[PDB]
Amino acid sequence: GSHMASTGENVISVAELINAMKQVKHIPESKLTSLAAALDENKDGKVNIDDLVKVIELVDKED
Ligand SMILES: [Ca+2]
């Protein structure tokens, strides 16, 4: 249930997230929508902004 964005952070939608990254970046939208839908725990079309920041923080980690 209540597990994601427990930081108390805002929420954006999948389409707006893909759109934002589609216009503020030029990465393959396939990944954009897939990642948003993967972060979309409820599969509702809405994704926590926390998820974006945490996924970037996690992707930021070099290996
Ligand atoms: Ca959701």
From Swiss-Prot:
Involvement in disease: Neurodegeneration, childhood-onset, with multisystem involvement due to mitochondrial dysfunction: An autosomal recessive disorder characterized primarily by global developmental delay and variably impaired intellectual development with speech delay apparent from infancy. Affected individuals have hypotonia, poor feeding, poor overall growth, and respiratory distress early in life. Other features include visual impairment due to optic atrophy, sensorineural hearing loss, and neuromuscular abnormalities.
Source taxon at top rank: Eukaryota
The family this protein is said to belong to: Belongs to the LETM1 family.
Role of this protein: Plays an important role in maintenance of mitochondrial morphology and in mediating either calcium or potassium/proton antiport. Mediates proton-dependent calcium efflux from mitochondrion. Also functions as an electroneutral mitochondrial proton/potassium exchanger. Crucial for the maintenance of mitochondrial tubular networks and for the assembly of the supercomplexes of the respiratory chain. Required for the maintenance of the tubular shape and cristae organization.
Residues involved in Ca(2+) binding: D40, N42, D44, K46, D51
Domain EF-hand: from-to ranges: 27-62
Protein source organism: Homo sapiens
Compartments where found: Mitochondrion inner membrane
Full protein segment contained here: 643 to 699 of 739
Name of the protein: Mitochondrial proton/calcium exchanger protein
Quaternary structure, from the entry: Homohexamer. Can form 2 complexes: a major (300 kDa) and a minor complex (500-600 kDa). Interacts with BCS1L. Interacts with GHITM.
